[PDB]
Every structure is written in structure tokens, then in C-alpha cells.
Design an enzyme around this catalytic site. Sequence first.
Site, PDB file in Angstrom:
ATOM      1  N   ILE A  42      38.319   9.942   7.040  1.00  0.00           N
ATOM      2  CA  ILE A  42      38.794  10.321   5.719  1.00  0.00           C
ATOM      3  C   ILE A  42      37.629  10.238   4.741  1.00  0.00           C
ATOM      4  CG2 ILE A  42      40.268   9.686   3.772  1.00  0.00           C
ATOM      5  CD1 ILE A  42      42.300   8.629   5.867  1.00  0.00           C
ATOM      6  N   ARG A  61      33.861   7.573   3.511  1.00  0.00           N
ATOM      7  CA  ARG A  61      32.824   6.608   3.862  1.00  0.00           C
ATOM      8  C   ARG A  61      32.523   5.718   2.663  1.00  0.00           C
ATOM      9  NH1 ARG A  61      30.586   4.975   9.011  1.00  0.00           N
ATOM     10  NH2 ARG A  61      28.716   3.766   8.440  1.00  0.00           N
ATOM     11  N   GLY A  62      32.230   4.455   2.954  1.00  0.00           N
ATOM     12  CA  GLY A  62      31.782   3.495   1.954  1.00  0.00           C
ATOM     13  C   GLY A  62      30.720   2.573   2.527  1.00  0.00           C
ATOM     14  N   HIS A  63      30.112   1.784   1.645  1.00  0.00           N
ATOM     15  CA  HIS A  63      29.044   0.853   2.016  1.00  0.00           C
ATOM     16  C   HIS A  63      29.563  -0.226   2.969  1.00  0.00           C
ATOM     17  CE1 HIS A  63      25.344  -1.584   1.384  1.00  0.00           C
ATOM     18  NE2 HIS A  63      24.830  -0.424   1.018  1.00  0.00           N
ATOM     19  N   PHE A  64      30.683  -0.847   2.599  1.00  0.00           N
ATOM     20  CA  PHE A  64      31.275  -1.960   3.352  1.00  0.00           C
ATOM     21  C   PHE A  64      32.177  -1.552   4.518  1.00  0.00           C
ATOM     22  CE2 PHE A  64      30.868  -3.653  -1.112  1.00  0.00           C
ATOM     23  CZ  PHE A  64      29.751  -4.435  -0.860  1.00  0.00           C
ATOM     24  N   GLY A  65      32.626  -0.302   4.556  1.00  0.00           N
ATOM     25  CA  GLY A  65      33.483   0.139   5.651  1.00  0.00           C
ATOM     26  C   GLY A  65      33.921   1.587   5.569  1.00  0.00           C
ATOM     27  N   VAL A 120      36.599   4.658   6.265  1.00  0.00           N
ATOM     28  CA  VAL A 120      38.058   4.788   6.142  1.00  0.00           C
ATOM     29  C   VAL A 120      38.566   5.865   7.097  1.00  0.00           C
ATOM     30  CG1 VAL A 120      39.987   5.257   4.568  1.00  0.00           C
ATOM     31  CG2 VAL A 120      37.932   4.055   3.742  1.00  0.00           C
ATOM     32  N   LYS A 135      40.886   1.180   6.498  1.00  0.00           N
ATOM     33  CA  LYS A 135      39.479   0.884   6.250  1.00  0.00           C
ATOM     34  C   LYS A 135      39.029  -0.226   7.182  1.00  0.00           C
ATOM     35  CE  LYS A 135      36.230  -0.314   2.567  1.00  0.00           C
ATOM     36  NZ  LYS A 135      36.237  -1.247   1.402  1.00  0.00           N
ATOM     37  N   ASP A 158      35.437  -2.079 -12.085  1.00  0.00           N
ATOM     38  CA  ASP A 158      34.939  -0.773 -11.650  1.00  0.00           C
ATOM     39  C   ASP A 158      36.022   0.286 -11.786  1.00  0.00           C
ATOM     40  OD1 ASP A 158      33.344   1.327 -10.609  1.00  0.00           O
ATOM     41  OD2 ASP A 158      33.340   0.511  -8.584  1.00  0.00           O
ATOM     42  N   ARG A 217      37.073   8.205 -10.039  1.00  0.00           N
ATOM     43  CA  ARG A 217      36.777   8.140  -8.591  1.00  0.00           C
ATOM     44  C   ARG A 217      37.544   7.046  -7.835  1.00  0.00           C
ATOM     45  NH1 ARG A 217      32.351   6.246 -11.083  1.00  0.00           N
ATOM     46  NH2 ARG A 217      31.911   4.011 -10.825  1.00  0.00           N
ATOM     47  N   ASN A 218      37.918   5.977  -8.540  1.00  0.00           N
ATOM     48  CA  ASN A 218      38.555   4.806  -7.938  1.00  0.00           C
ATOM     49  C   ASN A 218      40.060   4.710  -8.170  1.00  0.00           C
ATOM     50  OD1 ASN A 218      36.117   3.925  -6.801  1.00  0.00           O
ATOM     51  ND2 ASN A 218      35.534   2.855  -8.697  1.00  0.00           N
ATOM     52  N   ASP A 220      40.674   0.777  -5.215  1.00  0.00           N
ATOM     53  CA  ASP A 220      39.327   0.193  -5.151  1.00  0.00           C
ATOM     54  C   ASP A 220      39.282  -1.263  -5.647  1.00  0.00           C
ATOM     55  OD1 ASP A 220      36.445   0.214  -4.735  1.00  0.00           O
ATOM     56  OD2 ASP A 220      36.233   0.467  -6.909  1.00  0.00           O
TER      57      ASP A 220
HETATM   58  C1  LIG Z   1      35.479   9.746  -3.731  1.00  0.00           C
HETATM   59  N1  LIG Z   1      36.270   8.747  -3.042  1.00  0.00           N
HETATM   60  C2  LIG Z   1      37.017   7.765  -3.623  1.00  0.00           C
HETATM   61  C3  LIG Z   1      37.584   7.064  -2.577  1.00  0.00           C
HETATM   62  C4  LIG Z   1      38.443   5.911  -2.680  1.00  0.00           C
HETATM   63  C5  LIG Z   1      38.675   5.310  -3.901  1.00  0.00           C
HETATM   64  C6  LIG Z   1      39.457   4.180  -4.018  1.00  0.00           C
HETATM   65  C7  LIG Z   1      40.019   3.662  -2.865  1.00  0.00           C
HETATM   66  N2  LIG Z   1      40.827   2.576  -2.677  1.00  0.00           N
HETATM   67  N3  LIG Z   1      41.105   2.484  -1.385  1.00  0.00           N
HETATM   68  N4  LIG Z   1      40.481   3.492  -0.767  1.00  0.00           N
HETATM   69  C8  LIG Z   1      40.639   3.679   0.674  1.00  0.00           C
HETATM   70  C9  LIG Z   1      41.633   4.805   0.768  1.00  0.00           C
HETATM   71  C10 LIG Z   1      43.069   4.481   0.572  1.00  0.00           C
HETATM   72  C11 LIG Z   1      43.942   5.496   0.641  1.00  0.00           C
HETATM   73  C12 LIG Z   1      43.483   6.810   0.890  1.00  0.00           C
HETATM   74  N5  LIG Z   1      44.108   7.960   1.002  1.00  0.00           N
HETATM   75  C13 LIG Z   1      43.136   8.897   1.235  1.00  0.00           C
HETATM   76  N6  LIG Z   1      43.437  10.252   1.404  1.00  0.00           N
HETATM   77  C14 LIG Z   1      42.525  11.290   1.284  1.00  0.00           C
HETATM   78  O1  LIG Z   1      41.310  11.194   1.336  1.00  0.00           O
HETATM   79  C15 LIG Z   1      43.156  12.614   1.108  1.00  0.00           C
HETATM   80  C16 LIG Z   1      42.474  13.699   0.326  1.00  0.00           C
HETATM   81  C17 LIG Z   1      42.607  13.819   1.817  1.00  0.00           C
HETATM   82  C18 LIG Z   1      41.898   8.291   1.269  1.00  0.00           C
HETATM   83  N7  LIG Z   1      42.133   6.966   1.052  1.00  0.00           N
HETATM   84  N8  LIG Z   1      41.190   6.005   0.993  1.00  0.00           N
HETATM   85  C19 LIG Z   1      39.785   4.278  -1.646  1.00  0.00           C
HETATM   86  C20 LIG Z   1      38.995   5.402  -1.520  1.00  0.00           C
HETATM   87  C21 LIG Z   1      37.091   7.723  -1.421  1.00  0.00           C
HETATM   88  N9  LIG Z   1      36.287   8.745  -1.706  1.00  0.00           N
END
Ligand SMILES: Cn1cc(-c2ccc3nnn(Cc4ccc5nc(NC(=O)C6CC6)cn5n4)c3c2)cn1
Length: 291
Positions: free
Chosen positions: A32, A34-38, A40, A50, A135, A139-140, A153
Amino acid sequence: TDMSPINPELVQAVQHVVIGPSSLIVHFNEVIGRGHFGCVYHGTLHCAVKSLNIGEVSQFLTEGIIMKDFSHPNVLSLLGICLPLVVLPYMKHGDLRNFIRNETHNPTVKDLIGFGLQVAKGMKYLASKKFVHRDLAARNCMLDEKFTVKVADFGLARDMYDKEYYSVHNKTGAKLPVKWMALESLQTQKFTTKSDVWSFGVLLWELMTRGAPPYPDVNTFDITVYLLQGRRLLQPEYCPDPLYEVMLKCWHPKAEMRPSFSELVSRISAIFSTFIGEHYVHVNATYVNVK
Ligand SMILES: Cn1cc(-c2ccc3nnn(Cc4ccc5nc(NC(=O)C6CC6)cn5n4)c3c2)cn1
Ligand SMILES: [Cl-]
């Protein structure tokens, strides 16, 4: 600061957070994000998983219990943990910034103020639990299938999900979202609910610009010098005057004078109620393709 211009107990307590190993399938093929710590991943419990990296296992379990306690419709909840996996609800429409930037979406002024309003309700809740985000930015925050915004986040989901907007302080080495930070936090690296309020102000600006980068080409802690010349972000073309006044209150030089998230919910909900969904918000030509 310059503000004027120039363990058995833990094991039983964590049982309500743990997911059994056989009751969760992680799809390691479908990255789905990518991040520094893990990284997803897609998961089936349908969810987002994650995957992170003895002394630190206490910290992981304890963070889970604190995070599992947060329940609010504008806050990303924690479904559970598994052992180093953090299981979160899948957000169909991804992060709020990418959503509003997407040229195939057609948000109104009402829509975007609505997202802002939802974010404020989430922060109001978190602030009532004495939780400082540190933060807050578009984006978050994330968006589910019903267009419900969820502040994300935090806790075990904490990461840098776009490395572009984090700058290294030369002394401490801490990578910080300087364009979203309060004047006092830029100088001290201390964060409060009032410094979250500043960030929320910046988030409102992002919403009304459909995800333009704040302060183009002001990217380091030299933002502090820029702000102290007597400057704030300009009013976006589609931002109503009352909402811009709210943004300026969020960036009050004195932290104590900034509105609470309760007051922000109240004021934005009023502004929101005046719109009827006839103003389409289009993207500024000067912000297209700018990082
Ligand atoms: C630019 N950017 C921001 C994040 C982000 C920001 C805050 C977060 N807090 N937790 N997480 C993990 C998480 C949780 C539920 C979730 N649902 C999806 N669904 C999709 O990507 C859909 C569209 C196809 C992805 N995540 N990722 C986060 C990721 C990731 N990139
Ligand atoms: Cl409208």
C-alpha cells in the site's frame, strides 16, 4: 522564544488488543505504502497492516493499549496488534492531501471546509485525552469509503509517509515537519496542543488550495526567520474571509491566545453551514507540479 517580529500486569492488560496469529492474513505482495519505520500492506482480518522492526517490546504493547482506547469517528482506530504488526482499518480513499490534489475529484468549498471541520472534531477528541499529535497535516489524515476524515499517523502508526516535507535540524538530527510547526516549536522543538492548533491552521490552508505545498522554497528551519519578518501564508483564492480569519487566529504569535479545538469546531461548523455546494474549488496554476 522570539514571538514578536524583527511483566504479568502488562500481559493481561494488553489481551483486549492482541489478535491471534491464525485470525489474520497479511498480503505481502500488495505494498500500500512505505515509511521509515515500517512498510504498510494489504490485510484480511479487510485492513491495512504496518510491519515494524526485549526492552522495546514493553513499549510496543503499552502503546497498543493507549491507542486501542481512542474511539472517535474522526480518529483512525487500532483494530489490534500481532507479534511486529499494527492492524488498522483500510482507508479506501487514502491520504487527504492526495485526495484533494487529484484532478478527477471535484470538491466544493463546502466539501473542503467539511473535511477541515471533521479534522477539528478529531483533534478536539485527541486534545481532550491530553494527546499532542506533533505532526498534523493533510498527508497524515485519511479518508474512508463514506468520505469521513480520520486523523491518523499517531501511536504505533507514527511515521514519515512523505520524506519530502521533513527537514533535519543540524544539531539534534531530528527530522521535523517545519512548514507545519509553530513559531515556538521551531525554536524549542517542544510541542503542545496549541502547536497542533497552528498546524491545523496550515492544514486548512492546504484544504483550500487543494494540497499546495506551504511556503514554496522555504524548506529549512530558516522558515523561522521568514515568519519573524511578519509573514503568514496568503489567503487562498477559494478560501472564504471568515475561514482565513480562523487561520490567522491559529497562527497567533502567543500560543495561549490561539483558539482551542472546541472553539475551532464551533466556528468552522458555523462557516460550513452557510455554504450550499455551489462553489467548485479549482487548482491554482502557480501551484501545479510544485513540491
Ligand atoms: C502519503 N501517505 C500518507 C500515508 C499515511 C498517513 C497516515 C497514516 N496512518 N496510518 N497509516 C497506515 C495506513 C492506515 C490505513 C490505510 N489505508 C490505506 N489505503 C490506501 O492507501 C488507499 C488509497 C489506496 C493506507 N493506509 N495506511 C498511514 C498512512 C501513506 N502515504
Ligand atoms: Cl460551496
